Design a protein around this nucleic acid. Structure first.
Ligand SMILES: Nc1nc2c(ncn2[C@@H]2O[C@H](COP(=O)(O)OP(=O)(O)NP(=O)(O)O)[C@@H](O)[C@H]2O)c(=O)[nH]1
Ligand SMILES: Nc1nc2c(ncn2[C@@H]2O[C@H](COP(=O)(O)OP(=O)(O)NP(=O)(O)O)[C@@H](O)[C@H]2O)c(=O)[nH]1
Ligand code: SF4
Ligand code: SF4
Ligand SMILES: [Mg+2]
Lengths: 118, 61, 595, 263, 182, 71
RNA sequence: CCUUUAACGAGGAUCCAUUGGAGGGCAAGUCUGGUCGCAGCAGCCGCGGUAAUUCCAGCUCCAAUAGCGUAUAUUAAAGUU
RNA sequence: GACGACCCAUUCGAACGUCUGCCCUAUCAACUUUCGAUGGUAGUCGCCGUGCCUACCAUGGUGACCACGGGUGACGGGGAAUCAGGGUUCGAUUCCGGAGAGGGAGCCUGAGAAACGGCUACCACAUCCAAGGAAGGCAGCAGGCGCGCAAAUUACCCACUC
RNA sequence: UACCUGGUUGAUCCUGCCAGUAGCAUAUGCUUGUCUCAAAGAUUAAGCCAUGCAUGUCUAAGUACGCACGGCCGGUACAGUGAAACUGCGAAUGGCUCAUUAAAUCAGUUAUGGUUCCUUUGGUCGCUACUUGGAUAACUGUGGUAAUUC
């Protein structure tokens, strides 16, 4: 049973749910189901928790923070490219796009780009 | 006596475009496959019950 | 056409507030014979089975809807897909081979399951009543016109669906075919899938070894492997899970489960505990009378079908009789007289070897008038040891000779004695403890008379196993060597027979070395348990003999697999490899609850 | 059944002036919404395989209409069904053909081929006058065209000639006694004759007498009358038959006189 | 779809007088059953009912004219009525037997090539005649007046040009395999 | 005879000679009225019903001998 | 499937028409054998008590016919609503 | 060219309202009312008209020309069988209208639904479960059980008709 | 085809019913060559239901950085082909049943000048701007539950 916010004491309660709430998937428009969920307040009755690192300490835990993975994708929209590389209004963006490598295909490597909007 | 109904097209491509498929395949240049019936519907309802990846069911059952 | 009978017990079925209209307006209880027996009383209304003609008149004007109407199974020349001739077995229905799921086929022994597979395979084609002057790929297609099997059988004809089956028996083969080591399986076929099959088959041992040095395990393994690697369209698995380890059986079910999904048809058999949950997705039950008539019921969901098959008789939707507790022994009983006297023997800690095996025994107490249980994993050195103790090869150093004559139960049963079984029963004796005995294993409900006559060549697995069960308490001998009686028996036939075997050898003063792979088969039949530990084709240790509980805990601690008690009916239910509670039992180490 | 609008019309529910059979299946085409009413329409596909027989199946019409050889009222249409009715022009420019939809004396939409010059306009009845915003007038017609700034003497039950190219009517007829009229509904249908007389009732269902050039007098409701031109002088072309409305006896006599069923 | 009966049964089940008339009528024309008789008499009594209306309608009513004119044409076109009559009163003088003269099997016998009437029915069924260009197998053709001068045998038969039957060509092969090689 | 769907009792005639023997006690039968639609027929009083089929088999074929008892 | 066409395909014994009835109402046996108020038939009237035109059979005959019989609802017959 | 949007007209309708038409029964003759019955005045609500609802006020409304009540193996009509004339009997059922999806009630979405191939609850059922929970509604086509005197293939296919 | 016949008596004439007669539609018995058309779980239980299927949808033209295929090199709206996913639309049509329902349903006739109306068709389109703002899916990666289109 999943945990959501705003569901004080930690009992198992059956709330009405609809689009724009946690732990609901519509299979039809306007559909409303009444599934069971479980409260915010933590106990030892839980299987697993998700802790997000916020503040980084002095030390480096070996299996996580030492490992470094870059984020994949640059922007697809116009104005995000302008904000990012700090271009002026007049500079005519046409070569400030990220070029995403196709590593192999047994033919040749491509470099992909997205399609600008606005 | 026997009585039928016949078309005569000006060129091939005007027939090949217009023509219902089975009449073209009547003297072969086309076929069907596709493949019988059923194998479609039982796959469809299995594809319905996955989300994001359905490539297993399209090849894989 | 069929059978009809009344049934009576219900929630406030109240013979003390209805005046009893069931007795007042029944036609049978008017012409003299009391079918319905009732009074103003504290109990239930009583109604007979045999005297009820059917009618349903009592039901329509009982003031409470307590009495319902059942219909009992009977033959009425209906459908009749095939017969051999006359005074012989017949089958009615062979039904939909639904693709993209595996079809699980679950009935008592000698009921025609194997026969339905033979017909589905196109090999023994169906005869449908008669005698069978129609075939040929026309008349049967016209008969099962309007349905489905027209599309199936025309696709077969044309061999668009290519047939493969795993055969019911091992024996005739390792005898009918032969096998080149390595080279054989090799020039079988082809690649990645054989490597997946042999590796997920968890063997890793018999890659460099000749077939004749192998046993049940190796055999089954290779068989299944080749069968799968066999490039084909259809696929049939008869009885795939016989005489195999508990851990190894689960990894067999999932390698079968690989083949299913992309427009493929698949038929499995089996006589299960609760592993059929992972074997099949549709369960199809068969009913009737063993070796007389068999009827196939339309398929159900596995969860819904399982219980209704072992529940004791689920119909709705038809109906029948019998069927109930059998997934254990629920034979509540125990205690004796004074047991006097006894002994302390004791067999010594021998060290034994063959070629690719180091096999070791520890000293233990082999008590008078008392059972001993062997397991433990396939390849854990149990059978050949017993032969080496008795006389065949061995020993280099030391040993103890049997004080009592000896009874040999074999496991590799595929015997050849031309003539009849009755001739062989004269090499035993049918006068001794003459009051029932063989008759107390079976006589009244499943029939024997059924065990004589006929040929042993044409006899089926559980009956053939029963021939071997008789060959043991049948020459004069009192120390008993039994490997795998659970082979080719179900739950209904195995558990009662096992209890009968224990009663014989304990009560008239004997000792038996039982080599079960069955929770119910092992448990109710156990005491010492002795535990065999170690890796196949390396090392075997018989663990110094300890407690049923402690020995079973040693076996299941290494394997990593556990059971649950079905709480209403006291029945075993296997766990799904790795669960939640599959963690409380691992810690409590406890794999059995409620002694 | 109903909870909202329907989308099927069967064979046998459908009107009889489309001349449907009964040994093709349960459904009939059903015209989709448009300017004409379904008891006055001729659906497009019924013109193309139940009259002229270019097409043979409905799938053929779907392959034809997409090519854009079809027009209706000088504009291009591209669907299986369109609800063309009385006084519209179909125009196939590839064959160089032009049709007009008008009534036989039998009372069903015939083939009335015409010159392309005639097919540049149609005759439209006025039904309602409605003053729009800021002192601007409107017309409303049976083909549902709203033509702004008409001449200020045109009133309902008149008819007006519309140029399909530019809209914006060029000329008109005024409803008067002795002008020539056609019937568009009711028991009398397809009859041609002059007005002769009018009759008024305060309330509703005023009637309009009619007389033809065969010396017969008949009457019909007001709202089934349509004007075609001044007395004995249509401003349109007329088909054969010409509103005579022969008895069945005389029709028998013609057929056995010419002995006409072969060429 | 649409179906209806073409005959009716007699109100009385038995009556010595009736049965003899139905028997002797069937004898003359070679009819199979009384159902082939009552069929005729249904059509006739139907036509006798329609006529019985129009005589009571006003003279020179338009309904009376158009019906009668086109009706009598049909009675003349099949030839059960003359045009030297041509009025509605002679409809009631029409009777059962005149129809049966215009039956196919009757016209084969009467104006063509046959033995007894029992023969002629068999020739119609065994496909040895035609009507203008067209094979028939129905002895209940009832034959329009114009088509009486086109009744001929068939153009593929052993009667006239066309291949012989299997009794002749059998016996021809008895000259070659029955006494020529057997 | 007692009925299936009412449980009430009806007294029913049996036709031709020796057909009584082909009806055996505590089996099912099929009944039918005489052909006078409410009233007792002939010289037999108190009977308003007769019997036609014993068990999917007619009294005719049992009597004539073109069928046999199915038991 | 139908229509169209090869090649085989009729001597009556079989390439087999049945369902009811024969005292009257109501079309057809005061023929022969058996039963003897028994068994059964009979919508109705009535048949059977040792010479049965009505029962059980044989022969013959009658009606309808690829259909015919039986039960029940209902209309006509009913100017007995 | 494509798409979208505001209003008017049009089309497809939808919703209320007018006049006339109904099977058996009096061993059903008086019925309806502050738990609104009939009307007046004002308001609320609703897409709108309206005792639809509320406040205040009046005492009406209906019936031997059969009300009111009860019964119906009563869905209505276009029609069907028989029939000289006049009638009698039947109409579940291919077209049109209506009502309902196990029994009741409530509600979301949308232009349109008080929807059940949507949802929520109660009640009657029935299924799985590691007993913590979860899932369901064939009066759709086939098919099974039951019920009975009584009724078909778990077939083939979007080529036709839409 | 607007038709009658047998039965109360010793015999006759009436009254009157019973029986005989023909059609229609359901069941059932017996029999059965050839050809076309085709009604069919309504009657009783609007009783209860295993399994399978019966509603989905992309054009030149809403959104393509799938490590997909492809490329002739690309991306500078930028390809061609394109699974998946967001978006729009439909799912209120049809099919089925006859349980409820006696001025109700329904039919003919009338009324919106008492109202609402997707859609089509025709009109309506002027008191940082060289283009604005910030998140979600697919995707990538880590999971929980005996079990679910979770
Ligand atoms: N006479 C005869 N009987 C046969 C033959 N084959 C099978 N049978 C009989 O048919 C019955 C059922 O056979 P089978 O399908 O093998 O039974 P089963 O259900 O598979 N048996 P089990 O459950 O023990 O595995 C048995 O009584 C068997 O003896 C045969 O060739 N001849
Ligand atoms: N290398 C080798 N192995 C052999 C030879 N003979 C037999 N074996 C194998 O050695 C193993 C000894 O254990 P065994 O007692 O047979 O086991 P089991 O009792 O049959 N166990 P399970 O029934 O579970 O398979 C078996 O797998 C057997 O096949 C031999 O000559 N050489
Ligand atoms: S069953 Fe029905 S009738 Fe027989 S006793 Fe229980 S209640 Fe009284
Ligand atoms: S069922 Fe038929 S027989 Fe058994 S009791 Fe009820 S009535 Fe008597
Ligand atoms: Mg077997």
């Amino acid at each position: 049973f999943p945990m959501k916010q705003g569901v004080l004491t930690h009992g198992r309660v059956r709330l009405l749910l609809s689009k724009g709430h946690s732990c609901y998937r519509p299979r039809r428009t306007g559909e409303r189901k009444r599934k069971s969920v479980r409260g915010c307040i933590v106990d030892a009755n839980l299987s697993v928790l998700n802790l997000v690192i916020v503040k980084k300490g002095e030390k480096d835990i070996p299996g996580l923070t030492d490992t470094t993975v870059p984020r994949r994708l640059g922007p697809k929209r116009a104005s995000r490219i302008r904000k990012l590389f700090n271009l002026s209004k007049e500079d005519d963006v046409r070569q400030y796009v990220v070029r995403k490598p196709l590593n192999k295909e047994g033919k040749k490597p491509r470099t992909k780009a997205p399609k600008i909007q606005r | 006596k026997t009585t039928g109904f016949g078309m005569i097209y000006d060129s091939l491509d005007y027939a090949k475009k217009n023509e219902p498929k089975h009449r073209l395949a009547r003297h072969g240049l086309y076929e069907k496959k596709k493949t019988s019936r059923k194998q479609r519907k039982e796959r469809k309802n299995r594809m319905k019950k996955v989300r994001g990846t359905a490539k297993a069911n399209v090849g894989a059952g | 056409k069929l059978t009809r009978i009344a049934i009576v017990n219900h929630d406030k079925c109240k013979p003390k507030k209805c005046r009893q209209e069931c007795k007042k307006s029944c036609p049978v209880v008017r012409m003299g014979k009391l079918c319905i027996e009732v009074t103003p009383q504290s109990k239930i209304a009583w109604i007979s089975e045999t005297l009820c003609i059917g009618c349903g008149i009592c039901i329509k004007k009982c003031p409470f809807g307590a009495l319902s109407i059942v219909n009992l199974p009977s033959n009425l020349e209906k459908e009749t897909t095939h017969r051999y001739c006359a005074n012989a077995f017949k089958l009615h229905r062979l039904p939909i081979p639904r693709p993209g799921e595996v079809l699980g086929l679950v009935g008592t022994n000698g009921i025609g399951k194997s026969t339905a597979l033979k017909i589905l395979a196109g090999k023994q084609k169906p005869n449908l009543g008669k005698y069978d002057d129609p075939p040929d790929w026309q008349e049967i297609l016209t008969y099962f016109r309007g349905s489905e099997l027209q599309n199936y059988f025309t696709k077969i004809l044309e061999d668009d669906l290519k047939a493969i089956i795993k055969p019911q028996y091992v024996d005739q083969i390792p005898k009918a075919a032969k096998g080149t080591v390595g080279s054989i399986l090799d020039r079988k076929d082809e690649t990645k899938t054989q490597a997946i099959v042999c590796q997920q088959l968890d063997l890793t041992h018999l890659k460099e070894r000749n077939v004749e040095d192998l046993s049940g395990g190796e055999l089954q393994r290779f068989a299944c492997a080749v069968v799968c690697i066999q490039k084909a369209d259809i696929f049939m698995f008869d009885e795939p899970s016989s005489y195999l380890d508990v851990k190894q059986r689960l990894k067999a079910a999932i390698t079968i489960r690989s083949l299913i999904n992309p427009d493929r048809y698949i038929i499995v058999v089996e006589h299960d505990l609760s592993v059929l949950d992972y074997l099949s997705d549709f369960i199809c039950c068969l009913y009737g009378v063993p070796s007389a008539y068999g009827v196939v019921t339309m398929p159900f969901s596995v969860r819904e079908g399982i219980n209704i098959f072992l529940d004791g008789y689920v119909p709705t939707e038809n109906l029948r009789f019998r069927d109930a507790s059998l997934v254990f022994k629920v034979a509540e009983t125990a205690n004796e007289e004074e047991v006097k006297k006894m002994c302390m023997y004791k067999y010594p800690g021998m060290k034994k070897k063959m070629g690719e095996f180091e096999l070791a025994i520890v000293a233990g107490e082999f008590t008078d008038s008392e059972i001993m249980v062997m397991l433990g994993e396939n390849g854990t050195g149990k059978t050949t040891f017993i032969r080496m103790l008795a006389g065949r090869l061995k020993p280099d150093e030391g040993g103890e000779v049997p004080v009592l004559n000896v009874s040999y139960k074999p496991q590799k049963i595929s015997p050849k004695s031309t003539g009849s079984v009755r001739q062989l029963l004269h090499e035993k004796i049918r006068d001794a403890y003459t009051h029932p005995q063989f008759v107390t294993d079976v006589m009244k409900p499943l029939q024997i008379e059924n065990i004589i006559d006929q040929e042993v060549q044409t006899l089926s697995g559980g009956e053939l196993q029963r021939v071997a069960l008789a060959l043991c308490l049948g020459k004069p001998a009192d120390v008993y060597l039994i490997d795998e009686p659970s082979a080719y028996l179900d739950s209904e036939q195995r558990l009662m027979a096992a209890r009968v075997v224990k009663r014989f050898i304990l009560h008239a003063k004997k000792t038996a070395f039982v080599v079960e792979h069955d929770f119910i088969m092992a448990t109710y039949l156990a005491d010492r348990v002795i535990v065999f530990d170690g890796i196949p084709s390396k090392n075997t240790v018989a663990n110094s003999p300890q407690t049923l509980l402690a020995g079973m805990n040693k076996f299941l601690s290494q394997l990593e697999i556990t059971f649950r008690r079905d709480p209403n009916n006291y029945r075993p239910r296997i766990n799904k490899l790795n669960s939640i509670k599959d963690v409380e039992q691992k810690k409590s180490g406890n794999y059995f609850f409620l002694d | 059944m109903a909870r909202g609008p329907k989308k099927h019309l069967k064979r046998v529910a459908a009107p009889k002036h489309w001349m449907l059979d009964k040994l093709t299946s349960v459904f009939a085409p059903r015209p989709s919404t448009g300017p004409h009413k379904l008891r006055e329409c001729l659906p497009l596909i019924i013109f193309l395989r139940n009259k002229l027989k270019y097409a043979l199946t409905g799938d053929e019409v779907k392959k034809i209409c997409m090519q854009r050889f079809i027009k209706i009222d000088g504009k291009v249409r591209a669907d299986i069904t369109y609800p063309a009715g009385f006084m519209d022009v179909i125009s196939i420019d590839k064959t160089g053909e032009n049709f007009r939809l008008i009534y036989d004396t039998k009372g069903r939409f015939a083939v009335h081929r015409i010159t392309p010059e005639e097919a540049k306009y149609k005759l439209c009845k006025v039904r309602k006058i409605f003053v729009g915003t800021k002192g601007i007038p409107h017309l409303v017609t049976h083909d549902a065209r709203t033509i702004r700034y008409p001449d200020p003497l045109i009133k309902m039950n008149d008819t007006i000639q519309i140029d399909l190219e530019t809209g914006k009517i060029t000329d008109f007829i005024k409803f008067d006694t002795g002008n020539l009229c056609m019937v568009t509904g009711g028991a009398n249908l397809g009859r041609i004759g002059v007005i002769t007389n009018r009759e008024r009732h305060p309330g509703s269902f005023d009637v309009v007498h009619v007389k033809d050039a065969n010396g017969n007098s008949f009457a019909t409701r007001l709202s089934n009358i349509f004007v075609i031109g001044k007395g004995n002088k249509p401003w349109i072309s007329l088909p054969r038959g010409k509103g005579i409305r022969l008895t069945i006896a005389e029709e028998r006599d013609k057929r056995l006189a010419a002995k006409q069923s072969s060429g | 779809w649409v179906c209806r009966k073409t005959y009716v049964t007699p109100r009385r089940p038995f009556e010595k007088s009736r049965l003899d008339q139905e028997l002797k009528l069937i004898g003359e024309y070679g009819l199979r059953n009384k159902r082939e008789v009552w069929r005729v008499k249904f059509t006739l009594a139907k036509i006798r009912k329609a006529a019985r209306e129009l005589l009571t309608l006003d003279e020179k009513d338009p309904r009376r004219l158009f019906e009668g004119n086109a009706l009598l044409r049909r009675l003349v076109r099949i030839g059960v009525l003359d045009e030297g009559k041509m009025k509605l009163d002679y409809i009631l003088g029409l009777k059962i037997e005149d129809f049966l003269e215009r039956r196919l099997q009757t016209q084969v016998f009467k104006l063509g090539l046959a033995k007894s009437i029992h023969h002629a029915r068999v020739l119609i069924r065994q496909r040895h005649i035609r009507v203008r260009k067209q094979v028939v197998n129905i002895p209940s053709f009832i034959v329009r007046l114009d088509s009486q001068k086109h009744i001929d045998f068939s153009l593929r038969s052993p009667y006239g040009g066309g291949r012989p039957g299997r009794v002749k060509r059998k016996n021809a092969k008895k000259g070659q395999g029955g006494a020529g090689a057997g | 005879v007692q009925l299936i769907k009412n449980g009430k009792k009806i007294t029913a005639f049996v036709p031709n000679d020796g057909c009584l023997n082909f009806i055996e006690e505590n089996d099912e039968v099929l009944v039918a009225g005489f052909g006078r639609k409410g009233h007792a027929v002939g010289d037999i009083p108190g009977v308003r019903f007769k019997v036609v089929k014993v068990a999917n088999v007619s009294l005719l074929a049992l009597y004539k001998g073109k069928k046999e008892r199915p038991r």
